[PDB]
Amino acid sequence: IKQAQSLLGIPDYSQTVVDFVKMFQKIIFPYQLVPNVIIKLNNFDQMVKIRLFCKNDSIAISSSGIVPINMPDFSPPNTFDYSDYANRTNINFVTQRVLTDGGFSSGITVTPVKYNYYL
Amino acid sequence: PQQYINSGTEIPFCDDAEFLNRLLKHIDPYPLSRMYYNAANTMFYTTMENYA
């Protein structure tokens, strides 16, 4: 949290951790995304997954994304077929294109995007 | 030339003798014989590859 505040230029004595975290509640629901700060805090506690929703909400925001309420954190494995792009040929093609276009030689990594219950 | 420096300049030598001592300690258990062998053979094999 201190590193995040310093990066944002927030004086530590000025900002309290609770308020710092609450800052992203404006993002939680409207963008239907879990703030990275909350994700990292949950990971720290785990070393010592996330899920939430709103009143009357039909779906739950989770670290994995959108999930139907009361459903498991992951949809059935065969829900989506990624073979079209989730394949070595496509991955290598995209990575090589990126390397060429950016004139790079290292530090480049492309990953197929998987999808939970919803796209 | 992709890039260049101007004339003169100055080699940026380190100054922290304590830092130098720490590095020396960190490298003491490394056998110079093994490091030399590895480096020489690395260069030799890369040259071999280039030639071939």
């Binding site: - | 260049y4 080699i11 940026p12």
Partner: protein
């Protein structure tokens, strides 16, 4: 090779302290200055310069002049160049400088009480009688000799507050100039150029308006009115590496300086006196 580098006659009487004295060579120049360029810059924010007057064939009148080292934002103490005896102790952070330098300043301003206080304090140094008193004697004698040399009363018609149009009345800058020590007065004469120079009923104007100000606080790099004049100024690193190898360049540059221009110099029937 007489070293007139006042403020280089400073000896770190403290054993643990070593005084580099890294000051300008020109002290060995038998000029009207009694303080060479680096001391001048450090302790008065002035840079030595020369202003030629007649330079045609062999008439080479080259009046000396120093330059402001004060920007257009400094004010009050920050802007005062040569403080008066009433405020020099405040303008200068005497406590932040070596006691020998403090003694030099006190002698220059005739602060004999401060001189006595400093020597009394030095009385209680560990090697006081051994070498502290010797250092005191050396520094004091050198400073006193310089001051006597500067003072003309020892063994001409330059007026500094007489230029100021729009002033209510009074002048008195010349009054304070008189109140100054011989060394300070000679420094002012040497560094400040009268805006006007009259020779045997022949007036030359060098500026359309004086640049310096003199008042009770002392000499100030202020303007007679309006805002202040604009006065701007290896360890190989990663950033020091330059990228690939690859607008009035053809014209000379007028200095963005603020030379000390203030006063009127009157010269009697004497001709182009070049001795």
């Amino acid at each position: 090779r007489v070293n007139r580098c006042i403020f280089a006659s400073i000896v770190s009487f403290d054993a643990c302290i070593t005084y580099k004295s890294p000051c300008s060579p020109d002290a060995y120049h038998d000029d009207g200055w009694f303080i060479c360029n680096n001391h001048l810059i450090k302790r008065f924010k002035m840079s030595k310069m020369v202003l030629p007057i007649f330079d045609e064939d062999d008439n080479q009148f080259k009046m000396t002049i120093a330059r402001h080292l004060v920007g257009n934002k400094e004010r009050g103490i920050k802007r005062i160049l040569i403080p008066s005896a009433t405020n020099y102790q405040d303008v200068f952070n005497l406590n932040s400088m070596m006691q020998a330098e403090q003694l030099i300043f006190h002698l220059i301003y005739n602060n004999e009480n401060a001189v006595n206080t400093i020597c009394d304090n030095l009385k209680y140094t560990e090697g006081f009688t051994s070498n502290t008193q010797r250092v005191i004697h050396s520094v004091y004698a050198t400073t006193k000799s310089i001051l006597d040399t500067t003072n003309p009363n020892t063994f001409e018609l330059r007026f500094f507050d007489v230029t100021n149009a729009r002033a209510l009345r009074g002048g008195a800058g010349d009054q304070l100039f008189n109140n100054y020590s011989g060394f300070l007065q000679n420094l002012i004469r040497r560094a400040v150029a009268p805006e006007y120079l009259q020779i045997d009923t022949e007036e030359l104007r060098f500026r359309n308006c004086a640049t310096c100000i003199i008042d009770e606080t002392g000499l100030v790099a202020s303007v007679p009115d309006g805002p202040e004049l604009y006065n701007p100024i290896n360890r190989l690193q990663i950033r020091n590496v330059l990228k690939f190898e690859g607008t009035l360049s053809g014209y000379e540059e007028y200095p963005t300086y603020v030379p000390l221009f203030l006063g009127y110099q009157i010269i009697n029937s004497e001709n182009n006196f070049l001795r």
